[PDB]
Design a protein around this ligand. Structure first.
Ligand code: CLA
Ligand code: CLA
Ligand code: CLA
Ligand code: CLA
Ligand code: CLA
Ligand code: CLA
Ligand code: CLA
Ligand code: CLA
Ligand code: CLA
Ligand SMILES: CC1=C(C#C/C(C)=C/C=C/C(C)=C/C=C/C=C(C)/C=C/C=C(C)/C=C/C2=C(C)CCCC2(C)C)C(C)(C)C[C@H](O)C1
Lengths: 90, 175, 172
């Protein structure tokens, strides 16, 4: 009804292809699919290991293991980015 | 193009080396959000209050009016160690003199050179160039007096002595 | 292809002109972040690291008047804990925070394409007035700074094992 503002750098992200354009990856638009796939596997193993090392949680835990356990959900987004880049020829 | 005070930052577009005190020193972009006439008159008012306050704090320890409850040298403590009513009367005096001085104006309404409120009964500014030089003197001593008065009043919170007393006996042999 | 790493491809973001270029970016991190941000970040890490390695050596060489009486034994990172009880660190923190505030403004101006990475125009002595000798001092700053990051990490970690401190650990 009036112009709706969006921040500078807003681009068109609607896709009807097999995979979205690499622009949907933001700052990761230039990373290759091999690098996302290897980072995804790495993050999944390190995140699962760190998660496993602190499943009995105690009042004093190792702080690095806590931070490293956040790599398991991050790996899901990494392998989705690997599928997007492999189907974009990157 | 580049600020004189800060070589790497660009010059604040607003200043243009026109007002006295313009060494291009506005890194945080405060002139873009407010009018500079209001800011300059505010700067002059803060510096004038701080000049009066610095001189007052200095002399309180050295010389006090010889009456009971006016003998506490430490400025900070002298606020509490004094009749509340008398200082309250001074606060009320600060109100009327201001309303009359600025002709009864707000932030937009105040703008008349900024800070030129007319209270110069003696003819010091004979030469207009001597007036400009005295303006540079006023702003620089006002800036010094702002930092200086802040520095002594926080010394007085730390040392508990007063300006000259804190300077003369500064504990070199401990923290 | 890349110079430093012959099997790997030349980094896209990196350029020959960018001082201290060896074509070294195997993981392609320069593609992820803005290259000017990484350049400013590397230059800043270089300068902090240079100061820290020099400080580590100097702390083993001598001690400013009165410091022996606040801290007796602690040499590298132990001194920081005693000084935070005092005002020594808080003071450095406050003034460096103030200096970094204008560093933040400088970063914003750089990221819009105007200022150059690490260029704060701080050249009082006449050391860069040639623009060929200037290029050599820029590259020397980056190489000494990179060496200093590795060194500072090396010295602090050696103190973590032994507690000796850098030069005394060299002696014993
Ligand atoms: C921000 C300013 C400021 C503030 C809040 C105070 C506040 C105080 N002072 Mg200090 N004082 C100041 C400035 C200030 N003074 C200045 C500038 C001087 C002159 C150097 C003094 C000299 C002074 C003495 C000698 C004594 C106080 C005392 C006091 C206390 C009681 C008030 C009193 O009797 O005043 C008395 C004020 C005077 C005798 C002189 C004031 C003259 C003015 C402010 C300076 C000249 C200004 C100029 C002509 C134009 C003014 C315009 C203005 C009216 C808007 C109170 C805590 C008394 C106290 O309890 O001390 C512990 C005391 O004995 N003051
Ligand atoms: C129109 C001007 C005017 C008038 C009428 C007054 C009147 C008064 N002042 Mg104020 N005063 C003025 C200007 C004025 N002052 C100015 C220009 C300053 C300097 C900025 C002060 C600073 C000042 C202080 C610091 C104090 C007074 C006090 C007093 C009272 C003095 C009599 C007393 O001690 O108790 C009268 C009663 C008795 C003697 C009975 C006991 C009285 C209410 C004093 C007071 O009592 O405040 C409540 C006090 O401490 N005045
Ligand atoms: C170093 C001190 C200093 C200096 C150079 C000035 C200088 C100036 N003042 Mg300021 N002023 C000061 C301290 C000072 N002031 C303080 C402490 C107060 C508080 C009482 C004031 C309150 C004041 C008012 C209320 C007004 C001025 C005004 C002026 C200007 C004209 C008069 C002149 O030549 O005064 C020379 C003054 C001195 C040598 C100080 C003695 C001039 C630019 C007038 C103006 O038009 O502002 C631009 C005006 O209306 N001043
Ligand atoms: C012109 C301004 C001014 C001046 C001359 C001073 C001067 C002083 N201050 Mg004040 N101070 C200032 C601004 C200033 N300060 C400001 C803006 C703040 C923040 C609100 C403080 C807060 C402050 C505190 C909290 C303390 C002082 C202390 C001191 C003393 C320590 C000496 C020193 O700086 O060693 C350091 C100098 C260097 C490393 C050289 C560089 C000295 C008398 C200390 C004091 O009185 O000691 C007992 C103290 O504890 N000041
Ligand atoms: C990252 C840097 C860093 C840090 C955090 C510290 C921190 C400390 N040092 Mg180490 N030190 C440093 C650098 C550093 N120093 C450097 C560069 C040297 C000289 C080569 C030293 C030499 C040294 C000795 C010999 C001793 C300390 C000591 C101390 C402690 C007391 C605080 C003090 O008085 O230091 C004061 C430190 C200095 C004054 C040196 C700072 C010099 C740099 C070059 C400052 C330059 C500012 C720069 C020119 C401004 C540029 C402006 C531009 C950005 C526009 C504290 C742990 C004492 C201690 O506890 O050790 C047991 C001690 O005895 N330091
Ligand atoms: C953050 C750094 C730091 C710290 C915590 C201290 C702490 C101390 N200094 Mg030192 N000092 C420092 C930096 C420092 N200094 C620097 C950078 C200088 C300038 C070179 C000095 C110059 C200095 C002198 C000249 C003296 C002290 C003295 C003292 C001590 C007074 C009480 C005592 O030992 O008796 C106190 C332990 C005093 C002392 O007792 O030393 C013998 C003394 O006379 N200091
Ligand atoms: C320019 C203003 C300024 C001011 C007012 C102060 C004020 C102060 N500094 Mg800081 N300082 C400053 C600048 C300043 N500093 C800068 C630019 C540096 C270099 C980064 C430092 C580095 C520094 C260190 C490393 C230390 C202080 C300490 C102190 C305190 C002095 C200790 C005391 O009791 O006072 C009396 C002051 C004397 C000189 C008498 C002895 C006081 C809070 C010391 C402290 O322990 O804080 C409590 C302390 O160790 N300062
Ligand atoms: C081996 C040390 C070394 C070297 C060669 C340089 C070299 C340089 N610096 Mg860096 N710098 C260093 C350490 C060093 N710096 C450290 C430790 C600090 C922290 C205190 C800084 C903080 C710093 C700032 C804030 C700035 C520089 C700037 C510069 C350049 C111009 C000044 C010059 O020629 O200095 C020659 C220096 C030496 C021969 C070292 C002695 C030049 C590329 C300026 C720049 O990049 O603009 C072009 C600039 O503004 N430097
Ligand atoms: C400027 C770079 C530099 C330099 C000259 C040194 C030098 C040294 N380091 Mg350090 N180190 C560095 C960087 C550096 N390190 C960095 C970046 C790290 C990572 C945090 C370490 C972590 C490290 C550890 C954890 C240890 C050393 C140790 C050593 C010493 C013996 C290493 C050796 O010969 O067997 C190395 C074996 C080899 C097979 C080398 C090939 C030696 C003094 C050891 C030591 O004695 O220190 C207490 C030690 O335990 N270093
Ligand atoms: C914690 C703590 C504090 C502190 C503190 C400080 C100052 C902590 C500083 C920590 C630093 C700077 C660590 C850096 C380590 C460097 C590493 C791991 C590089 C390894 C190089 C590798 C793997 C490969 C290198 C490579 C090789 C060999 C081959 C190719 C070349 C290259 C790529 C170079 C305090 C002061 C608050 C006190 C408090 O009580 C305790």
């Amino acid at each position: 009804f009036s112009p709706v503002p969006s921040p500078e750098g807003t681009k068109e992200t609607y896709w009807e292809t097999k995979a979205p354009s690499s622009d949907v990856l933001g700052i990761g638009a230039g990373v290759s699919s091999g690098n996302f796939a290897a980072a995804s596997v790495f993050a999944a193993l390190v995140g699962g290991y760190c998660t496993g090392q602190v499943i009995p949680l105690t009042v004093e835990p190792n702080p690095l293991f806590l931070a490293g356990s956040f790599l398991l959900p991050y790996s899901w987004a990494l392998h989705v980015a690997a599928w997007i880049q492999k189907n974009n020829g990157k | 193009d580049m600020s004189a005070s800060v070589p790497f930052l660009p010059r604040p577009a607003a200043l243009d080396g026109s007002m006295v005190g313009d060494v291009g020193f506005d890194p945080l972009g405060f002139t873009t959000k407010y009018d500079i006439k209001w800011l300059r008159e505010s700067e002059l008012k803060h510096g004038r209050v701080c000049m009066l306050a610095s001189l007052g704090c200095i002399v309180q320890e050295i010389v006090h009016l010889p009456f009971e409850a006016t003998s506490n040298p430490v400025a900070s403590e002298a606020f509490f160690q004094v009749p509340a009513g008398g200082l309250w009367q001074i606060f009320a005096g600060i109100g009327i003199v201001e309303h009359f001085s600025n002709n009864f104006k707000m932030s937009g309404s105040t703008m008349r050179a900024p800070g030129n409120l007319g209270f110069d009964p003696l003819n010091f500014g004979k030469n207009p160039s001597a007036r400009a030089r005295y303006e540079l003197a006023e702003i620089k001593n006002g800036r010094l007096a702002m930092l200086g008065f802040g520095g002594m009043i926080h010394g007085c919170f730390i040392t508990g002595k007063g300006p000259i007393g804190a300077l003369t006996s500064m504990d070199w042999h401990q923290s | 292809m890349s110079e430093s790493v012959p099997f790997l491809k030349k980094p896209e973001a990196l350029d020959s002109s960018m001082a201290g270029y060896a074509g070294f970016d195997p993981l392609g991190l320069s593609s992820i972040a803005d290259i000017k941000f990484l350049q400013e970040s590397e230059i800043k890490h270089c300068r902090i690291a240079m100061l820290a390695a020099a400080g580590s050596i100097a702390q083993d060489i001598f001690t400013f008047p009165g410091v022996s009486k606040v801290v007796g034994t602690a040499k590298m990172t132990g001194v920081h804990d005693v000084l935070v009880k005092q005002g020594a660190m808080g003071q450095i923190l406050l003034w460096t925070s103030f200096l970094e505030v204008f560093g933040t403004i400088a970063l914003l101006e750089t990221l819009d394409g105007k200022r150059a990475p690490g260029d704060f125009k701080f050249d009082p002595l006449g050391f860069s007035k040639n623009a060929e000798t200037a290029k050599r001092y820029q590259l020397s700053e980056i190489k000494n700074g990179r060496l200093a990051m590795l060194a500072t990490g090396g010295m602090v970690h050696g103190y973590f094992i032994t507690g000796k401190g850098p030069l005394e650990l060299l002696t014993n």
